[PDB]
Amino acid sequence: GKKLLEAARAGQDDEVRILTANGADVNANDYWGHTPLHLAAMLGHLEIVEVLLKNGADVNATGNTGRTPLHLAAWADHLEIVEVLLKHGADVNAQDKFGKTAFDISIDNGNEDLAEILQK
Amino acid sequence: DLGKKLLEAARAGQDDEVRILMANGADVNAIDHNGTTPLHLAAYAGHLEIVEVLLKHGADVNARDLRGFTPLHLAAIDGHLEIVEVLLKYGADVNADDDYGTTPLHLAAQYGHMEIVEVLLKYGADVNAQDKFGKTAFDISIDNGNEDLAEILQ
Amino acid sequence: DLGKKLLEAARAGQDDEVRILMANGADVNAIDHNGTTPLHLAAYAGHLEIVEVLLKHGADVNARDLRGFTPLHLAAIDGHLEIVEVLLKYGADVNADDDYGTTPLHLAAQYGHMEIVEVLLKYGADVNAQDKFGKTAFDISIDNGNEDLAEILQ
Amino acid sequence: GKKLLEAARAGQDDEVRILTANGADVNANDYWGHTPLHLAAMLGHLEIVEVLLKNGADVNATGNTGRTPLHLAAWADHLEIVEVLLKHGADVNAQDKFGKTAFDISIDNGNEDLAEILQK
Amino acid sequence: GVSAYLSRPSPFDLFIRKSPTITCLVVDLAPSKGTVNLTWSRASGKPVNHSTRKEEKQRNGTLTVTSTLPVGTRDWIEGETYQCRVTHPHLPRALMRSTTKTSGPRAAPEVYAFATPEWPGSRDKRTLACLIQNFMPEDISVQWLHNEVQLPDARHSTTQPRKTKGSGFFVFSRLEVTRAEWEQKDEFICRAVHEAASPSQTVQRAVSVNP
Amino acid sequence: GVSAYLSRPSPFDLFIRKSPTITCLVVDLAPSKGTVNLTWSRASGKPVNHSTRKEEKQRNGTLTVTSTLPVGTRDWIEGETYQCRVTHPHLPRALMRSTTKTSGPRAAPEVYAFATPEWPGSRDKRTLACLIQNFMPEDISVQWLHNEVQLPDARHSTTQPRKTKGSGFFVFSRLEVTRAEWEQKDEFICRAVHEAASPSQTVQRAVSVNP
Ligand SMILES: *[C@@H]1O[C@H](CO)[C@@H](O[C@@H]2O[C@H](CO)[C@@H](O[C@@H]3O[C@H](CO)[C@@H](O)[C@H](O)[C@@H]3O)[C@H](O)[C@H]2NC(C)=O)[C@H](O)[C@H]1NC(C)=O
Ligand SMILES: *[C@@H]1O[C@H](CO)[C@@H](O[C@@H]2O[C@H](CO)[C@@H](O[C@@H]3O[C@H](CO)[C@@H](O)[C@H](O)[C@@H]3O)[C@H](O)[C@H]2NC(C)=O)[C@H](O)[C@H]1NC(C)=O
Ligand SMILES: *[C@@H]1O[C@H](CO[C@@H]2O[C@@H](C)[C@@H](O)[C@@H](O)[C@@H]2O)[C@@H](O[C@@H]2O[C@H](CO)[C@@H](O)[C@H](O)[C@H]2NC(C)=O)[C@H](O)[C@H]1NC(C)=O
C-alpha cells in the first residue's frame, strides 16, 4: 500500500493517480513519518500535490520531526507549491521540534521572496 | 536446473520447495554467477527456518561469494539476530574478512544493529580489525552517525 | 613478410624498391588489414610508374578493399588522370561499385575532376549509376558545388 | 615550409615560434590565398598573430577574395585582434572582391561594438 | 533558455554519402512570439548554397529549429570556415557559432568486435560490442552491418569520443542482435568511417555469436 | 559565471567503504576577493555532521571549492534529502542544490569482459574492455582487479551511463595492461558495485589475455 510513497518521490504522475484510485493510503508514512504529500512538495512535483489534495490528503500532517508538508516546500524554495498548499488551509504558525516555521526556514535560507508569501 | 530453483526458493522463503528440490538432489551449496549459495540468500532475506534446514543438510556456513561475504556478513547487514546466533552456533567465522577487509562487525556498525554487535563481540569479534582502507568498526559507526554504538566498539 | 615492405614501397613511391622486392618474391597482390593492395596504394598516391610495374606483373586491376574500392576509385579521388587511363586500358571495371554503390564517376564528381569524368565517360561510365542513397554522379557534383561539372554529367 | 599554416590553425602557441626560427614563410598561402596571420586572426589566436607580426608578416595581406586579416577578424567577431592589427596598422577602407570592408561585415553581422571600434 | 550548436560534417556524410553538410541547431526552452532566423556565411565571402530549415515543437513546450547547409568536400578539407547566426526579436544579442576542419595529429582507428555469451533468459537475443580506439582526430562515424545490410542507427548505441590520456580517442558501440539474425548469418561487422584511415577512410571488424 | 553541483554518494563509498559522503562542488570561472560559503541542511532538520572543505585555483585561473559531508547509510537509503546552499558576497542570489536516494525500477548489472588480440606493434601492451549493461538505477562504480590488488582508478576510463536502446543503462570500461602484468598472473577482474546486485552489491567478470 506504500507504493504511493515511491510514486510520489519518483514523480510518475499517472502511476500515482492509478494507485490512489485503488484506495492506497494517501496518509502513508516513510521512515521519517512523512506522507506522499511531503515528498511531492519537497521534490517540487506540483502536479501530484493536487491529485493528492483531490484525494483529501492531510495538508498539515506532521512528520516524526514535526514538519508539515509546507515546511519542506519552503525548504526546497518551491514558490507556487507553497501558495497552493497555503490556499488549502496550511498552518503557518506550526513549528517543528526545533521550533521553526516555514518562515524561519526561508529566513535561514535567505529566501525573502518566499518569506513575503509567508509574511503576506 | 535444481541449483537455480533452489537459490530462488531459498531467497523467496519457499519453505517446502527447498525440501522438494533437495529431495531431487539439488546441491545444498549450489552457487550462482557471483558465488551466492542458498544459505547466503536465506540469511540475507531473513528466513531463519530455511537457514536452519539448509545447515542441517550440510550447507557450508562459511561459504564466500565473489566479494568475500559469508552468510554472517549478510545476516549482520539486515540485522537478523536469531540468524546470526544460529550461524555462529554452527561455526560461522565472526572475524571473516571480505576482499576489502570488511568483517561482520563492520557491517553491524554501519547499519546500527546494536544487538547484533553485542552477540558478535560475545563470540570474539576483533574490535581492532581494519578494512583495507584502515578503518575499524568504531570508525564505521562514527562515520555513520551511530555514536551511541561507538562506545561499545572501542 | 616481403609483402609488407612492398605495400610500404608502393605507397611511398620507391620505384626501384618495388622492383627489388618483386624480384625477391614479394606478392604483387599482398593485402594489409583492410584488403588494400600495392596497386591500390600506388594508384592513390599517384605513382604511375609503379602502377604499370604491378599491372604488368599480375596485379589484379579490379582488386577491392574491404569497403569495395577498386584502384580506379582511389585514382579518381586523388585526380591522377594517367593512372585512370592505364587502369582502364588494363581492364578496370569502370562501373565498379563499393559497398554503398559508389562508382568512380561519383568520386570524380565529388572532387571536381572534369578531365577524369570524361575519360570515365569515354570508357562507358554509366551516367545513371545510383549509390545506395539514390544519388547519381550528377547529384553529387551539384551538392558539392561543381555546377560546371554537372553540365556534362548528362 | 607550409607547416606554419597548419600550426596557425591549430593554435599551437610555441610550435609557431620554433617554426619561425627555421624561417617558415610567414606569407605562405593556403587554398584561400590566406596567410597564417589571416588564420590566427580568423580563429582568435592572438599570441600567434603577434609573433607573426614580430616576424614581419604583412598585416594588409590579401587573399584570393581580397580579404585581409582585418576582414577575417571582423567576420569572426574577435574584437581584440582587430584592435591589435589596427595598432600595427591596417587599411580599414580595404574592400574585397564583393565590395565589402571590415565595417560593412560588422553591419551585416550586427556587431555594433565592433563597428564602434572601427569608425573610431 | 536558448542555446545554439553547430556541428562539423559527419565522416559518413562526407566520405560515404559524398554529400557533406553542416547543421545549426537551436533549442528554445520558452518560445516567445517572433520568428527564429538562421543565416549562413563563409569566411572567404564566397556564396553559400541553399539551406534547409526544419522546425518541431516537443511535448514540454520547447521549439527545436535546425538549418542544414550543403558544403563542398574540397571546400571543407581545404579549411573553409563557416558561421551560423541565430536571431530572434526577444533575444538581446544575436548568437554566432562557427565550424571548420579538424586540426592536430592524425591517427587511424583500431576496431575490435566482441560477442556476449548466451544467458538462460536471453537465449533469443545477445549483445555485440565494438571498441574503436587510438584514433585522432575525434570525429568518427560508427556503423553495424549484417548480410550486406546496413543496420538502422536506432539499433545500436555509441559512446561519446573520449581521450586516452596519451594516445588518441576511443568510442564504444553496443548492439543487441536476435537469434533470427545470427541463424540467417553469423557475421556482424562494425565499421568506422574516419579521416585518417587511409586510403579508403574505413576500418572494420567482424564478429560471430557462435565460434 | 559560478556553477554548483551536488552528487549522490558513489556506490563504492556506500557499500564497499561503508562510509558514504556527498560533495558540493562550486566552480568559479573568474574569482573575486570574496569568500564562498557552503552550508548544509537536512530536510528533517536533524543535525548535519562536520563537513570538510577543499580549495584549489586551477591554471586557467578558476577556483574550485568543494565541501564533503558525511551522511548516514541508514538516512540515505531511507530517503533523507540534503541541500547545499552557496552564498558569495558578489553573488546576487544564493544557489541551492539538493540530493537524495535514487528512484524508479531496480535492475542488477550484467558484466562481460573482453581482451583485444596481439597487434604487432602492441606486443607488450594489450587493451581489456568491460561491458556493464541493463542496470537500474544509473548510479554504479567500476573497478579493475589483478593479483587480488585493486588497480588505481586512473588506469581505466569508464563511459558515462547511457540509456539502452532496449531496457536499462550501460557503461563501458577501457583498461590497458602490460606484458609484465599478464605474465605474472593472466587474470584481470572487472567488478561493478551496484545497489540492485543482490545480495552483496557486486557483480564481476574475469578475462585473460592469452587464449
Ligand atoms: C524537452 O526540451 C528539451 C529542450 O532542451 C529537449 O532536449 C534537447 O534536445 C536537443 C537536441 O538533442 C539537445 O541538444 C544536444 O545538447 C547537447 C548538450 O546538452 C549537445 O552536446 C548535443 O550536441 C545536442 O546539441 C538539448 O541539449 C536537449 N536538452 C535537454 C538536455 O533536455 C527535449 O527533447 C524535450 N523533451 C521532450 C521529448 O519533450
Ligand atoms: C578550465 O575552465 C573550465 C571551463 O570550461 C572548467 O572546467 C569545469 O570543471 C568542472 C570541475 O572542476 C566541471 O564540473 C563538474 O565536473 C565533474 C567531474 O567529476 C562532474 O561530476 C560534474 O557533473 C561537473 O561536470 C565542469 O564540467 C567543467 N566545465 C567544462 C565546460 O568542461 C575549469 O574551470 C577549468 N578546467 C579544468 C579541467 O580544471
Ligand atoms: C532571414 O534572413 C535572411 C538573410 O538576410 C540577411 O539576414 C540578416 C540577419 C542580416 O545578416 C542581413 O545581412 C540580411 O538581411 C533573409 O533573406 C533575404 O530575404 C530577402 C527577401 O526575402 C531577399 O531580398 C534577400 O536577398 C535575402 N537574403 C539572403 C542572404 O537570402 C530572410 O528574408 C530573413 N527571414 C526572416 C523571416 O526575417
Side-chain angles (χ1 to χ4, degrees), chain A residues 1-13 16-120, chain B residues 1-3 5-154, chain C, chain D residues 1 4-14 16-120, chain E residues 1-32 34-48 50-58 60-122 124-149 151-162 164 166-211, chain F residues 1-55 58 60-84 86-92 94-100 102 104-122 124 126-159 161 164 166-211:
Chain A
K2 62 162 169 294
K3 173 60 202 174
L4 182 52
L5 280 194
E6 161 73 2
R9 170 183 279 269
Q12 292 275 324
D13 307 352
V16 161
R17 301 177 173 177
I18 54 177
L19 297 158
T20 59
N22 285 7
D25 202 357
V26 294
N27 293 331
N29 288 284
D30 75 359
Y31 183 75
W32 320 102
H34 296 206
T35 69
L37 194 60
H38 299 67
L39 307 175
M42 175 190 68
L43 295 189
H45 297 308
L46 173 63
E47 314 84 15
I48 290 167
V49 304
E50 316 191 7
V51 177
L52 291 169
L53 286 173
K54 294 178 181 68
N55 276 285
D58 188 341
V59 305
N60 280 288
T62 74
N64 286 170
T65 60
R67 293 226 171 160
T68 191
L70 200 69
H71 291 124
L72 309 180
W75 183 80
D77 297 330
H78 288 317
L79 273 75
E80 196 175 17
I81 313 201
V82 167
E83 46 175 347
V84 164
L85 298 190
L86 281 159
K87 159 181 63 180
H88 290 67
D91 183 10
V92 188
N93 212 357
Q95 297 176 0
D96 45 33
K97 303 299 168 183
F98 319 102
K100 289 183 178 61
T101 75
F103 191 68
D104 287 338
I105 292 184
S106 295
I107 297 303
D108 305 350
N109 291 0
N111 192 353
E112 192 172 349
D113 283 335
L114 180 52
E116 283 209 358
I117 290 298
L118 304 149
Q119 273 172 338
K120 287 278 177 73
Chain B
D1 59 353
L2 301 165
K5 309 210 260 178
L6 179 57
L7 287 161
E8 299 171 2
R11 169 59 160 103
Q14 308 193 309
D15 195 335
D16 287 345
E17 185 65 7
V18 164
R19 298 189 177 97
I20 290 167
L21 290 162
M22 295 213 273
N24 279 265
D27 191 350
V28 69
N29 294 307
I31 54 155
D32 73 339
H33 58 292
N34 204 299
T36 307
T37 58
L39 182 55
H40 276 114
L41 300 167
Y44 178 63
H47 303 320
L48 164 63
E49 203 268 357
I50 278 175
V51 163
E52 294 185 349
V53 167
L54 290 169
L55 285 170
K56 309 189 173 294
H57 289 242
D60 182 7
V61 76
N62 280 134
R64 289 152 208 266
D65 65 359
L66 280 187
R67 179 190 168 157
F69 272 5
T70 63
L72 187 52
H73 285 96
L74 296 172
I77 291 165
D78 277 11
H80 304 304
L81 171 61
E82 283 260 344
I83 301 190
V84 167
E85 293 173 1
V86 177
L87 288 179
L88 285 168
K89 285 173 163 140
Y90 272 69
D93 183 13
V94 62
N95 283 330
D97 274 83
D98 78 343
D99 294 354
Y100 308 96
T102 298
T103 63
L105 198 61
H106 285 108
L107 298 163
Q110 176 184 8
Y111 287 84
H113 301 308
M114 188 166 48
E115 202 160 354
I116 303 296
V117 167
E118 315 189 90
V119 173
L120 297 180
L121 285 177
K122 306 203 193 251
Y123 272 72
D126 189 335
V127 295
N128 297 318
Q130 296 166 22
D131 65 4
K132 286 169 183 159
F133 315 102
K135 280 193 174 183
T136 77
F138 172 82
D139 302 332
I140 298 296
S141 60
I142 283 302
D143 289 335
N144 279 282
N146 292 114
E147 319 208 10
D148 305 342
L149 193 46
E151 310 163 350
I152 320 297
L153 290 172
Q154 48 203 350
Chain C
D1 210 15
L2 301 153
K4 194 215 204 156
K5 278 173 281 186
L6 177 62
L7 294 157
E8 294 168 4
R11 174 42 158 99
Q14 312 195 278
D15 188 13
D16 266 316
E17 186 76 341
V18 162
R19 287 168 206 262
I20 292 172
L21 290 157
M22 276 168 53
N24 278 271
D27 190 4
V28 75
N29 290 300
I31 64 165
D32 69 13
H33 286 291
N34 214 64
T36 314
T37 59
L39 181 60
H40 276 117
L41 299 171
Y44 180 61
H47 305 308
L48 179 71
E49 219 279 326
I50 308 172
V51 161
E52 291 177 342
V53 170
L54 298 166
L55 268 176
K56 294 185 280 183
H57 286 70
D60 184 15
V61 73
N62 287 309
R64 298 167 192 262
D65 60 15
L66 281 183
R67 181 181 162 170
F69 272 51
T70 66
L72 181 61
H73 282 96
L74 292 163
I77 291 175
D78 211 28
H80 303 315
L81 173 82
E82 310 80 5
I83 290 192
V84 166
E85 295 179 8
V86 178
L87 288 175
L88 286 166
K89 297 179 179 175
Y90 272 78
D93 189 358
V94 73
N95 289 317
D97 299 331
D98 82 335
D99 281 7
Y100 308 95
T102 294
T103 56
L105 191 63
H106 287 96
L107 301 165
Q110 174 176 4
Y111 293 86
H113 297 150
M114 188 170 304
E115 65 284 346
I116 297 202
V117 307
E118 47 192 47
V119 170
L120 294 175
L121 285 176
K122 278 191 179 72
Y123 279 81
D126 196 293
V127 178
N128 314 336
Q130 266 183 56
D131 60 8
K132 280 166 181 84
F133 310 110
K135 296 174 84 87
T136 67
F138 171 86
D139 305 323
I140 295 304
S141 74
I142 282 293
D143 293 317
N144 276 284
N146 316 327
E147 265 191 50
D148 285 325
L149 194 45
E151 286 174 10
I152 78 163
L153 279 163
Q154 306 169 4
Chain D
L4 182 62
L5 198 132
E6 322 169 355
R9 311 187 89 267
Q12 313 273 32
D13 307 76
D14 276 358
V16 171
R17 299 180 188 171
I18 61 173
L19 305 153
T20 59
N22 270 296
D25 195 12
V26 293
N27 289 351
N29 301 1
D30 62 11
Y31 197 65
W32 325 100
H34 292 137
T35 80
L37 186 65
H38 293 74
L39 273 60
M42 184 154 72
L43 285 306
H45 306 308
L46 177 47
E47 305 303 352
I48 292 87
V49 305
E50 270 171 42
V51 304
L52 282 74
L53 289 173
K54 282 181 161 59
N55 279 249
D58 197 6
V59 195
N60 293 61
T62 174
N64 300 108
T65 48
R67 298 218 167 182
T68 61
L70 205 66
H71 285 73
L72 299 202
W75 177 84
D77 288 296
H78 295 314
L79 298 86
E80 187 168 11
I81 287 167
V82 189
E83 302 163 3
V84 165
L85 307 177
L86 282 185
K87 167 70 165 293
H88 294 75
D91 194 25
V92 194
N93 313 333
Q95 299 172 11
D96 59 24
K97 301 281 153 90
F98 322 71
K100 312 230 167 181
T101 172
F103 178 75
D104 285 353
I105 294 174
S106 79
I107 304 299
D108 293 350
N109 291 344
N111 196 357
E112 76 175 7
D113 283 343
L114 177 64
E116 290 171 13
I117 320 180
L118 285 174
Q119 303 181 101
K120 184 58 179 171
Chain E
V2 191
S3 76
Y5 310 89
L6 174 57
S7 76
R8 282 176 292 261
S10 78
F12 190 91
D13 286 341
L14 164 69
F15 303 118
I16 304 307
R17 288 185 178 271
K18 312 163 281 294
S19 298
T21 63
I22 55 168
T23 304
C24 201
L25 163 71
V26 187
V27 288
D28 205 326
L29 278 301
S32 75
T35 63
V36 167
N37 206 352
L38 292 87
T39 63
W40 298 91
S41 82
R42 289 163 68 173
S44 61
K46 301 206 75 83
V48 295
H50 283 298
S51 56
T52 312
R53 175 206 178 95
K54 197 191 288 181
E55 318 176 17
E56 43 184 350
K57 191 271 187 188
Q58 269 89 13
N60 50 10
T62 60
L63 183 68
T64 290
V65 182
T66 45
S67 197
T68 300
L69 175 83
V71 309
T73 291
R74 177 61 29 68
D75 283 307
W76 183 261
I77 54 172
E78 293 284 24
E80 185 60 350
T81 311
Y82 304 76
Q83 163 188 279
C84 180
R85 290 186 48 254
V86 185
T87 70
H88 190 267
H90 288 106
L91 261 187
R93 315 292 87 69
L95 278 163
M96 188 279 293
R97 260 77 185 153
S98 65
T99 195
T100 183
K101 87 175 187 177
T102 67
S103 59
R106 269 184 36 159
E110 311 176 359
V111 175
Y112 310 99
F114 305 106
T116 58
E118 201 174 3
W119 193 286
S122 75
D124 288 340
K125 259 185 177 174
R126 209 177 312 173
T127 300
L128 305 177
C130 194
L131 173 54
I132 300 163
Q133 72 174 354
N134 303 147
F135 63 84
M136 331 182 67
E138 66 259 31
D139 288 358
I140 190 78
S141 290
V142 183
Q143 197 179 7
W144 279 97
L145 303 99
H146 173 243
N147 197 18
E148 293 148 293
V149 185
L151 264 50
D153 291 352
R155 299 208 40 183
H156 69 94
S157 300
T158 303
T159 71
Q160 265 179 348
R162 309 186 110 87
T164 71
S167 181
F169 295 83
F170 68 87
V171 295
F172 278 101
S173 185
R174 181 187 166 273
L175 167 79
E176 283 185 49
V177 288
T178 67
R179 167 174 295 274
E181 278 161 344
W182 74 69
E183 284 181 352
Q184 204 181 30
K185 190 179 204 182
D186 208 1
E187 204 173 29
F188 302 87
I189 303 190
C190 168
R191 192 172 291 180
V193 186
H194 187 274
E195 323 171 17
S198 161
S200 58
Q201 284 82 50
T202 45
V203 185
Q204 72 184 57
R205 181 75 65 159
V207 64
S208 291
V209 175
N210 308 296
Chain F
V2 166
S3 71
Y5 320 93
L6 189 43
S7 65
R8 287 177 290 260
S10 72
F12 190 92
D13 287 359
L14 169 62
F15 300 115
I16 306 311
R17 291 182 169 277
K18 314 161 285 296
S19 185
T21 58
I22 59 192
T23 305
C24 201
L25 170 47
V26 178
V27 185
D28 183 298
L29 264 177
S32 177
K33 192 154 281 201
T35 74
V36 309
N37 203 9
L38 309 97
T39 45
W40 287 103
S41 64
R42 298 169 47 161
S44 62
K46 278 176 83 53
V48 295
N49 305 70
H50 319 304
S51 58
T52 307
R53 184 192 164 112
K54 283 211 311 158
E55 256 161 320
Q58 267 80 17
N60 45 1
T62 80
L63 185 67
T64 58
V65 181
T66 76
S67 190
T68 306
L69 180 72
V71 310
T73 301
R74 182 55 62 162
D75 306 333
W76 186 262
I77 54 188
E78 294 297 337
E80 182 68 276
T81 310
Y82 305 80
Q83 96 181 10
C84 170
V86 175
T87 57
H88 174 264
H90 278 213
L91 281 185
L95 299 72
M96 184 265 287
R97 303 280 173 272
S98 60
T99 183
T100 188
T102 54
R106 277 175 96 263
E110 310 172 12
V111 186
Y112 313 86
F114 310 106
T116 54
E118 180 185 352
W119 193 286
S122 88
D124 295 339
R126 215 54 66 78
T127 299
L128 304 182
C130 191
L131 174 49
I132 307 181
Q133 61 171 14
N134 292 338
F135 58 89
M136 275 175 312
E138 60 181 348
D139 286 2
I140 193 154
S141 304
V142 193
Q143 198 191 12
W144 274 99
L145 292 160
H146 174 245
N147 245 338
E148 301 169 272
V149 162
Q150 194 184 155
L151 289 193
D153 297 336
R155 282 207 48 183
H156 66 92
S157 302
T158 301
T159 64
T164 65
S167 290
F169 292 92
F170 80 93
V171 297
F172 279 95
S173 178
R174 188 187 176 273
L175 166 80
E176 291 186 70
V177 298
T178 47
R179 179 184 284 294
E181 281 175 312
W182 69 73
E183 281 183 349
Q184 163 179 193
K185 192 178 180 178
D186 196 12
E187 184 180 271
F188 305 82
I189 303 182
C190 176
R191 178 172 280 157
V193 178
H194 195 276
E195 49 179 348
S198 71
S200 294
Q201 283 83 57
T202 64
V203 183
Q204 76 184 47
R205 168 67 67 164
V207 66
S208 281
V209 180
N210 288 323

